[PDB]
Amino acid sequence: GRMHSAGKGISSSAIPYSRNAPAWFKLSSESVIEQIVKYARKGLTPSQIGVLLRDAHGVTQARVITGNKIMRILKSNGLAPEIPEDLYYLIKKAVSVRKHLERNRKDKDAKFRLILIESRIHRLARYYRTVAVLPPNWKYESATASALVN
Amino acid sequence: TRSSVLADALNAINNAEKTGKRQVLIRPSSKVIIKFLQVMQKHGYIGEFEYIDDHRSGKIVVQLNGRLNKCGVISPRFNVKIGDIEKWTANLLPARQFGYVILTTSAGIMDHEEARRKHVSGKILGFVY
Amino acid sequence: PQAKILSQAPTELELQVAQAFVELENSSPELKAELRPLQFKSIREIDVAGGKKALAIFVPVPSLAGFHKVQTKLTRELEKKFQDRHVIFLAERRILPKPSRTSRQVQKRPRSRTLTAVHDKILEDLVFPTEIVGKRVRYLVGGNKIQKVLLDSKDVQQIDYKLESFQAVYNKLTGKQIVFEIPS
Amino acid sequence: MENDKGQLVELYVPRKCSATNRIIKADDHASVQINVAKVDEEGRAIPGEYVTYALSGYVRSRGESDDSLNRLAQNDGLLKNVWSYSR
Amino acid sequence: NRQKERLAKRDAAIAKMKEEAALEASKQPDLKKME
Amino acid sequence: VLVQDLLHPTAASEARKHKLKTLVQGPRSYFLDVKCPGCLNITTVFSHAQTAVTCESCSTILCTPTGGKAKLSEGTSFRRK
RNA sequence: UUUGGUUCUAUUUUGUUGGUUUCUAGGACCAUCGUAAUGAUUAAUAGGGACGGUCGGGGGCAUCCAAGGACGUUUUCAUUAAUCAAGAACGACAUAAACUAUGCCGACUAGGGAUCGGGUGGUGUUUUUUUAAUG
RNA sequence: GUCGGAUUUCCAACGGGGCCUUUCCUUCUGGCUAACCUUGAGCUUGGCGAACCA
């Protein structure tokens, strides 16, 4: 696909066929749940959590070790962010690009990529509004984008 | 993007039979593919086929005989009443003695002859001869 | 007592295996109180082509990990205790029917309560110490489907004599025919 | 094919390829008929006793005549370990 | 949620009775290890 | 080839392909259990480590991230788990 | 099956028509008791996002700034997607023989070698510190 | 078995219904109580409401 480019490259993860996994892991479920809540207490996104349990310890996926996925147990433990991580990284990239544009006016490909980034932002905002993980009337504007990064 | 999975399935069958190979891989295996190949199998057009399952959607391996001329899909699935069944078989079949138009009715997916016997109609899926 | 190990329905043979359960409970203190909390719902007799019948022991679903901890040991004692027998532990799961158009809605049916999900679960629970590496379905020209299950080649010595017993009990329970293969 | 009651019709029921099981047309001038003589316990072939394999022009033109000939030769038993099902 | 409380109560009861009989199991000697 | 076994490809050619192009897709990576000099403290490290993984007891970093398989440090003792 | 409290309506009758009620009959609201296997579909060779080493005569500014593709991934989301009237940005004011004179997305179908970016393996070659890791 | 018409115990095919396999495929007041454990001796005195409705 790659709507905002022309690349057709396929590069991703190949999840193993073993749904119950991996018969060499000795820690318990509650051990890794307390690991995720301790690691998310200090302010990390769930992608960083997944890679950091993937490489420091033996965790293939948190979905197959526990019974459920990651921000399911984060929202059950009360550590769900007010906006999820993908939209947050998109809007922080947007305000960084807008800071570049207000610094340098003539970076005109930066204008083009800013329109691309806000297109992705509006698509994710529409999807998050129709599933109501965001309230309706929530809208992205630049003045609230400067402070919405938090 | 990949819209009609059955269309890509039947296209793979058509290309493999035109090249002359006796086996073909299909990705990614909806239910209507399984019913379609069951209908083609019960009439002696393909033979045995195999359902590989990964945990995503599944793959089909079909052993092909030399008995297939063309299988095809009809997109979109038009609504077909009783008179439109023989208007369709007049339209897109080779002859009046063989060839089968496949349609899904509320009593399952079947060819036009046993749909005539059950006296039911539905939505047209495709054809095989 | 033998009545405590039985959950609801008393017959003679489940009382006998409950006596075997409490006899294994009082002996072997290394595994004592590991088999104490668990009870089993029911017992089923399966006839196989080999002539040695099968004890399908249906247990509660939430207690299944407790059987999974000590399953090899208690199954070995259960083969020893009963001659010409093969013992298997299954979890009695609930199948909820598919809601039709005319029927009134009874909540939302969870996806673990469908027929295919519980059939795959009891197929996994037949072969416990091995792990299934792949499945296939043979669609024959006569219309019959025969499902082939591939087992991981490690530790197959526990279950290699019991494969036709697995085929018989799966054919009785689900009405589908399966063939086991070991890729090497 | 037939009409209603006997009287066999359809002159020239055509041969069919032994590889892809398609029929061979009358002017398919690339189609061949391989005739293999069989041997009876002495190392010598008997004149008039054959097995026969018809190959169409399409499979021969694609170059796939030899692999298919391997497969039907090994299927009839006169070949031992040249063609593999697993490729 | 009465159901989660009931689940936690039955889990705690099972664990407590398991530990209570595990004390008696540790009190009893093992002829299997000696053999 | 016009007749071949798509059900049972040979092990060499099914190990030859890309990881998504096989019969069923699966990962070609693996986990190692690595012991560091000094304290024992056996660790499990994924092959494409993606970060500077250290021992939990002390800053004795075992792998540095690399765009493919991550390189391991000079003094280790690792096994494939 | 139950056990509380609140509230509303109500026939046969109690000796009659009206008036105060109780039990009962039927609601609706509230409380905590017990029943259940307590309850969330995969993670599409779909897509978005994080991460790691890179790669590019990409861009701007001055003489650093952010962005992007591919690769790798047992990381995260979960169908967020394809094409697009109106509208908008850029375009040697809105043009061109703006061309691949060939719209975009998706699948399949014969090959062969060279090349670019990445990755895997080969006790392969060479260099360093003959020898390691790199390259 | 009638003099080119038609039947029955029958091998088969084709579509239908009912029951069981974890599979309620809404139920309350009423009546017919229906198919009634209802059996009087080989056609009698008494089961569950839709198969009939409100």
Side-chain angles (χ1 to χ4, degrees), chain D residues 28-39 43-44:
Chain D
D28 188 348
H29 280 326
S31 62
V32 289
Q33 174 144 339
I34 298 304
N35 252 22
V36 188
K38 37 206 195 310
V39 192
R44 297 164 191 84

Side-chain angles (χ1 to χ4, degrees), chain D residues 54-68:
Chain D
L55 288 133
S56 83
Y58 175 91
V59 47
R60 207 190 171 208
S61 64
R62 293 297 271 194
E64 295 305 85
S65 66
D66 80 21
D67 321 275
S68 44

